[PDB]
Amino acid sequence: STEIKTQVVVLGAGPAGYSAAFRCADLGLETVIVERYNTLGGVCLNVGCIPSKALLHVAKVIEEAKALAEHGIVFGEPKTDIDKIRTWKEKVINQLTGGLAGMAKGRKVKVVNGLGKFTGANTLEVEGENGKTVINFDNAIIAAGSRPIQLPFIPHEDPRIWDSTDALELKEVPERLLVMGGGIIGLEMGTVYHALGSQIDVVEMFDQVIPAADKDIVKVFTKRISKKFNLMLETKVTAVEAKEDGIYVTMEGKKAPAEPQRYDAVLVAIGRVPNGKNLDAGKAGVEVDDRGFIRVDKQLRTNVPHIFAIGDIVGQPMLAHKGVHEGHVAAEVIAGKKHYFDPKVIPSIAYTEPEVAWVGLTEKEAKEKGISYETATFPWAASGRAIASDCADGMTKLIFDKESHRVIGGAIVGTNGGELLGEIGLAIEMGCDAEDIALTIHAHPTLHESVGLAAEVFEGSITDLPNPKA
Amino acid sequence: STEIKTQVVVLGAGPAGYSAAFRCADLGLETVIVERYNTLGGVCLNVGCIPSKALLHVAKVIEEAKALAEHGIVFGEPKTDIDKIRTWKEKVINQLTGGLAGMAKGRKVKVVNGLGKFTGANTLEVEGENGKTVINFDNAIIAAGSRPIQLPFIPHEDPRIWDSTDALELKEVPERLLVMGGGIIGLEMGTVYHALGSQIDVVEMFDQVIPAADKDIVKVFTKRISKKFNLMLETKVTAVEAKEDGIYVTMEGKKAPAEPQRYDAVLVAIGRVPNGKNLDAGKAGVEVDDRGFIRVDKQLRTNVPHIFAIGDIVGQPMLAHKGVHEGHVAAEVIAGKKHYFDPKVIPSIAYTEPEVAWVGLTEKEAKEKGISYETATFPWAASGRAIASDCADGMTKLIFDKESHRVIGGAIVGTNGGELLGEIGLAIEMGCDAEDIALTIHAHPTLHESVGLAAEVFEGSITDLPNPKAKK
Amino acid sequence: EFAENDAYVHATPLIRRLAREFGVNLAKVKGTGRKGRILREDVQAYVK
Ligand SMILES: Cc1cc2nc3c(=O)[nH]c(=O)nc-3n(C[C@H](O)[C@H](O)[C@H](O)COP(=O)(O)OP(=O)(O)OC[C@H]3O[C@@H](n4cnc5c(N)ncnc54)[C@H](O)[C@@H]3O)c2cc1C
Ligand SMILES: Cc1cc2nc3c(=O)[nH]c(=O)nc-3n(C[C@H](O)[C@H](O)[C@H](O)COP(=O)(O)OP(=O)(O)OC[C@H]3O[C@@H](n4cnc5c(N)ncnc54)[C@H](O)[C@@H]3O)c2cc1C
Secondary structure (H helix, E strand, O other), X not given: OEEEEEEEEEEOOOHHHHHHHHHHHHOOOOEEEEEOOOOOOHHHHHHOHHHHHHHHHHHHHHHHHHHHHHHOEEOOOOEEOHHHHHHHHHHHHHHHHHHHHHHHHHOOOEEEEEEEEEEEOOEEEEEEOOEXXXXXXXXXXXXXXXXXXXXXXXXXXXOOEEOHHHHHXXXXXXXXXXEEOOOHHHHHHHHHXXXXXXXXXXXXXXXXXXXOOOHHHHHHHHHHHHHHEEEEEOEEEEEEEEEOOEEEEEEEEOOOOOOOEEEOEEEEOOOEEEOHHHOOHHHHOOOEOOOOOEOOOOOOEOOOOOEEEOHHHHOXXXXXXXXXXXXXXXXXXXXXXXXXXXXXXXXEEEOOOOXXXXXXXXXXXXXXXXXXXXXXXXXXXHOHHHHHOOOOOXXXXXXXXXXXOEEEEEEEXXXXXXXXXXXXXXXXXXXXXXXXXXXXXXXOOOOOHHHHHHHHHHHOOOOOOOOOOO | OEEEEEEEEEEOOOHHHHHHHHHHHHOOOOEEEEEOOOOOOHHHHHHOHHHHHHHXXXXXXXXXXXXXXXXXXXXXXXXXXXXXXXXXXXXXXXXHHHHHHHHHHHOOOEEEEXXXXXXXXXXXXXXXXXXXXXXXXXXXXXXXXXXXXXXXXOOOOOOOEEOHHXXXXXXXXXXXXXXXXXXXXXHHHHHHHHHHOOEEEEEOOOOOOOOOOOHHHHHHHHHHHHHHEEEEOOEEEEEEEEEOOEEEEEEEEOOOOOOOEEEOEEEEOOXXXXXXXXXXXXXXXXXXXXXXXXXXXXXXXXOOOOEXXXXXXXXXXXXXXXXXXXXXXXXXXXXXXXXXXXXXXXXXEEOOOOXXXXXXXXXXXXXXXXXXXXXXXXXXXXXXXXXXXOOOOOEEEEEEEOOOOEEEEEEEEEXXXXXXXXXXXXXXXXXXEHHHHHHOOOOOOOOOHHHHHHHHHHHOOOXXXXXXXXXX | OXXXXXXXXXXXXXXXXXXXXXXXXXXXXXXXXXXXXXXHHHHHHHHO
């Protein structure tokens, strides 16, 4: 039994956790990280955002190489070696995890490996490689993240029923693969495996993939992927059975095939749930709600004043950049700064082909909350940059308060569309109106100039399009 | 002959002129465009920005496809059909030139084809496909653009001596191509032909390529292109002689070969000169300076109050988006609006590999102006997106006023680096504090979150990097 | 004292952090910047 005393213990080492710990250290606090896996970086680095972006980049090049054939540059069919692809994915991750371990050492943040559970209001017990460590803390930051949802009628134990982690292991390219759920994670993995040779089926219970994103934005994306995938909207899996020749999924719904279909693999990507029930947090007095979230205020503080919680485990949206910024505020508060986490906006990007990206209010949300709004759209069919890069179906959309003309949201569907979110996010945070945006000179020819041109549509000054507001 | 009267005549149909014409039309003014080429869109659309970025996108896919083989995705050597690439480039251009003609039709803006010259303060004459058309006008907007510099001792009439227009025509893939000039246009053309198989030499008289860009940004760029190009800095061309077996170029300077070198083609891309002397502008009383610029005030007026000028022809920077915005203001002023052209920023992008992009003040300009500044950089070696997209040598740089902490300049070097300028340019226009940028939540993992992270470097709050601004 | 009102919604992230640190009602701060924007000087002047 080892025993340790620290000012701050951080439970979990994903983007929220290690950002919190590193901020604590930089502010002079003695800090320990507890992490049950052998590397830092949590879900995002090891089995999430980073490996999936790496495989989506390979997928994007493969598709760009083929699109060039009509242009007079003819590549031969790519010879694939999924073992080398995997070994490169693994190299990318190890470079980043080593760099995290190195910054933890440079900041003198101790890393304790093993599973942590609260035993008192100031006591954390870790069960790991070195036996049990008892950690006495002045403050705790819970950052234990989330986990994939499983369905019970599914034989999840079968090695052909995948979660997102299985899909990112890249153990094989199944001839026919089903994606359950039209969420971003599922569509990204379908994008990857299609580029590698898989026939992709997608079953989604609602009337559109990516349900949070606006209809006009998703209409463009759906038109594209409806040629690469067989997409079953308003359809539900009603039973799954594992046989020796493949997994049999019977569906009920509009597009549901009559007969049980056969697949070589099934990716279950129907969402994620928080890990808040698995920490004995109640032994420290911490309130955990019915869904397993640990609720916090805008200083990321739980109902126990010296215990904070950050990242996926406190609520939606479950995204790495939210967790990172929450980790900074939690560390700053503990260090004595009167800081709060209250962003106007949090961006979301689907790294699909084309990308779908949005920030601030959607039209759905604006309608619910009763905001009087007006949209302005720039079609990429009029963008020389987009035509010259074969992405002319894209679209850039801004959303403005009708009366004040301030921007309150925006969205892009298109190749490299995610990178345009930076300007729109900043515009909302700075309180820009359409005129502020339209009058800023944007570089031509670029995709991001479509943000200024959308503002010009609203202002009635646009000249790269017909101008109905003249 | 034919006689026409209009409220506004626009001379030239590039980004500056057609934007001015269409804005005039939207403000209710009777407008006529004069254009010597067969299509609208000027240099940018027909022999400029648009065809170059089309070919650059081809070059970037070629090089990204080769780079994938080391990671287990082996494309065979690319079989290339030069004339099919020509056809595709022209299909891209024709889609936009048809769009501009359609929008001119819909706004009822007449296009007179031919070469226009002023004959009086209120009269312009055109010679073109309909013969002579004399155009009486209440207002004129001179938008006649610029042209490549030529040197007197260069035999430009040889088909192997190119300007940028020749280069975009894709006449042949020369085995050895000399690029004269280390500016943006010549570097971009070197990037295209290198990817098509040319060996590329670049000769630049100054001690760095892209002279306006900051030294630290260009250092990253120069390290990459030095693998692909023979870069000859502080070197000057002194003679060019056409022989049957190729073009022999004599150079002087630090890396000049003793012997004149043989090239299959020479691209002359040493800069551009305004067309202001070629218009008989003097016949309308318009003053043209000795460089050929038609200088204008903040409302785009020349010395003759009803005659405006916009775009390359009024001064540096010779960029399309400058001309577009000047075009809008000139039109708005003719329509009676108290509008001014005085942007805080005008962005610049080199679509090379990697791209070099900057906006606002450079460190060079800040030192000239005597401004107390601090830089903050985020290296892409620390970016998961850059690593996982195989472009980890990039860098993002913000420049802050040391006293006020407002952002006054930014720069990127990296793959897709140019698309990040939009956020930085707006941040400078809106006078953002470094904290305003830092506290804005940028999506992860992306290249553009490096903008936020660079602000966190300045603020001393960064955790994705060692923090030298941390406590002791 | 502090409230998440319309002045707070419109303010920049710097001013929102300043206002919340010092318990300021931004509706009572007169912005002297372009288009009524609330500047850091406005907030610092208001505390005294
Ligand atoms: C396939 C996939 C792709 C994604 N792509 C993106 C994307 O592009 N952009 C984006 O913003 N987000 C993306 N996400 C979401 C992102 O990964 C998460 O939002 C982020 O990792 C949350 O960070 P966190 O620190 O809150 O939690 P985590 O990173 O999940 O968890 C922290 C760590 O704590 C550990 N832990 C848990 N309980 C204990 C315990 N009792 N003791 C010790 N250790 C414990 C966990 O094992 C984990 O390593 C993706 C997720 C997935 C699955
Ligand atoms: C290879 C290359 C790449 C470039 N890439 C970029 C880039 O990526 N980004 C960028 O911002 N800029 C770029 N530029 C510069 C950009 O093309 C110019 O800044 C822009 O075209 C200037 O617009 P303008 O309307 O002022 O002039 P122009 O586009 O030159 O238009 C003037 C038009 O008027 C015509 N004309 C001239 N005199 C007469 C006359 N007397 N009568 C009738 N017609 C006349 C000309 O033939 C021309 O069509 C590039 C230029 C080149 C050469």
